Amino acid sequence: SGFRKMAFPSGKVEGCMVQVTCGTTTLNGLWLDDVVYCPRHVICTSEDMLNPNYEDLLIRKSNHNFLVQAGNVQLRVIGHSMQNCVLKLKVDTANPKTPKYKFVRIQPGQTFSVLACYNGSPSGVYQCAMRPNFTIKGSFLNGSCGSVGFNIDYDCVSFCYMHHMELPTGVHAGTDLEGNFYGPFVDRQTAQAAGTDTTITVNVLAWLYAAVINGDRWFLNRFTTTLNDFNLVAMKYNYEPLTQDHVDILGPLSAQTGIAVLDMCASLKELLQNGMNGRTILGSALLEDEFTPFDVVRQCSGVT
Amino acid sequence: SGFRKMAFPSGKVEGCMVQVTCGTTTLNGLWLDDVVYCPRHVICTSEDMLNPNYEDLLIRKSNHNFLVQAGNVQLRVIGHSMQNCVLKLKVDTANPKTPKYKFVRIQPGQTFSVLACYNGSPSGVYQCAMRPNFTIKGSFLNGSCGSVGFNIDYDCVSFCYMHHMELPTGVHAGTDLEGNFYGPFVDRQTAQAAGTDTTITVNVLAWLYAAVINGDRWFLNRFTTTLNDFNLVAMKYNYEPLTQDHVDILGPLSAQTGIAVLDMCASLKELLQNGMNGRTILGSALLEDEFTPFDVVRQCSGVT
Ligand SMILES: *CC(=O)N1CCN(Cc2cccc(C)c2)CC1
Ligand SMILES: *CC(=O)N1CCN(Cc2cccc(C)c2)CC1
């Protein structure tokens, strides 16, 4: 029993982190096989960051200008290329700690673990969600860029995020491992405002299911609703619209608890309309939206 | 910027987890050098758990009855002993992945990471605090026993917790790695109620400092207080008394922010007396007490 904001064990990713230095700029890289992936802004001075021409800046860089250190051992760079907003550095040595891996581009509302790193060294691990506005609410200081987000399926790491940017509002933007930004963001020191941070409705409902499974049941009421009726309330409260696909995805939690998805929708409706009245659910005084239905099943079933 | 509930990277501990099976009971063990540490209740049937005599039960067990598996490789048990509520299994092979380590017995209010494991396999990592009633609010299913809590100082893992028990109220009890329970709990299926779960005041104040550093400042007010005056309010709200030792420990956060500890006490006082009025601090609608002053400094300074 108990329900915690839980990250994947980070060991397999820890074994992949390196330091990348180009001139005076140091950030983190991800060493998989004989390729080191890092943000392309490693090649910039902060002077460059106002309006960098990455293709022009990269012409001035040779393989020997990319200093790649894995622990206290230097890797030999034998090629480099830009793919979107990441650099790929070819090294002469396959990472012996390379796990089974994939590169995935996640959807908004999907959760992942971040291994925060500085100078190629792991500092901590936490759980994030890709927000509906394609930002993430992370914990990233200067030097953290190139830190990655991932999911683990038994022995396979799916890398979904690399950290590139802090918006002036203190939220985070980054890329998949093909170097494509989530959302409309660019690796430029410019006016970039996030859109509406809407609540991930399917995640809240999953977490209400997690609450019932763990004995927090005070919010269960006598009501039901319809998708259309619920969605009128969701709109009013900046909640994502709930789709039949979302209902289908909650089916297993519905089955385990015997609470129909639309009945749990009606509980959520009353919580939105009435608030918590100073009560808590799984130790929270607000509705948590950074657990997926898959996350709730996993934590409630104990998958390794 | 941003502030997250952050666990230590778990790789060094992942390399230490094994499966221990005694007859039909399987839980987790911690393999350090040539010793596997696990809860002594591995030797019980659930029949035994009402009033087990561990010394008598252990007489019936030989080295060959303790099946220890590290990945899919079996370890040879060459000795076994009971120390308090843990078994120490001597194996013929030093764990090659043994990190620099210590065993520490933590104080209430201290935070640590848990690597939740099932059948010797890591499932997830989260951050806990030893509560003032010597319980922890964890996420532990059947098979999770022998999962450990730890802190990391650069390259040294300090193991502070092993998971043994769920109280009927769904909170968690366990031992240090000398097998001494935190609090008054016993490894017996009996009536064991937790005392008052008081709020860790010094941790709340640290997290208010973390909020100010990260731009959440609405709760800062025009007031100060005294330790004695604050402590009258702390008592009323089931907050731990604040000591001058706590004030001394907050000194660095005081210095960084230029907010006197007693001024931040007066902010906390008004928050206790007035509530959040539907506002949030670092994405929370309640006062977070599972970050130590050391944790706030680390996350705010980026230690690896
Ligand atoms: C994440 C990290 O380490 N950072 C330090 C370098 N910064 C460079 C930068 C890139 C893109 C936009 C801006 C404004 C700055 C990024 C943060
Ligand atoms: C943590 C875990 O894996 N558990 C399964 C075995 N249970 C045995 C037990 C020990 C002490 C008290 C009780 C009531 C049960 C513990 C939980």
From Swiss-Prot, chains A, B:
Catalytic activity field: TSAVLQ-|-SGFRK-NH2 and SGVTFQ-|-GKFKK the two peptides corresponding to the two self-cleavage sites of the SARS 3C-like proteinase are the two most reactive peptide substrates. The enzyme exhibits a strong preference for substrates containing Gln at P1 position and Leu at P2 position
Residue numbers of the full-length protein present here: 3264 to 3567 of 7096
Annotated active site: 41 (for 3cl-pro activity), 145 (nucleophile)
Protein name: 3C-like proteinase nsp5
UniProt organism field: Severe acute respiratory syndrome coronavirus 2 (2019-nCoV)
Underlying gene: rep
Mutation effect (residue 90 to R): In strain: Beta/B.1.351
Residues of the Peptidase C30 domain: 1-304
Function: Cleaves the C-terminus of replicase polyprotein at 11 sites. Recognizes substrates containing the core sequence [ILMVF]-Q-|-[SGACN]. Cleaves and inactivates human TRMT1, preventing tRNA guanine(26)-dimethylation of tRNAs. May cleave human NLRP1 in lung epithelial cells, thereby activating the NLRP1 inflammasome pathway. May cleave human GSDMD, triggering alternative GSDME-mediated epithelial cell death upon activation of the NLRP1 inflammasome, which may enhance the release interleukins 1B, 6, 16 and 18. Also able to bind an ADP-ribose-1''-phosphate (ADRP).
Cross-link Glycyl lysine isopeptide (Lys-Gly) (interchain with G-Cter in ubiquitin): residue positions: 5, 90
Subunit annotation: 3CL-PRO exists as monomer and homodimer. Only the homodimer shows catalytic activity. Interacts with host FBXO22; this interaction promotes the proteasomal degradation of nsp5.
Regulation: Inhibited by pyridone-containing alpha-ketoamides compounds 13a and 13b. In turn, alpha-ketoamide 13b (tert-butyl (1-((S)-1-(((S)-4-(benzylamino)-3,4-dioxo-1-((S)-2-oxopyrrolidin-3-yl)butan-2-yl)amino)-3-cyclopropyl-1-oxopropan-2-yl)-2-oxo-1,2-dihydropyridin-3-yl)carbamate) inhibits SARS-CoV-2 replication in human lung cells. Inhibited ex vivo by michael acceptor inhibitor N3. Inhibited ex vivo by compound 11a and 11b.
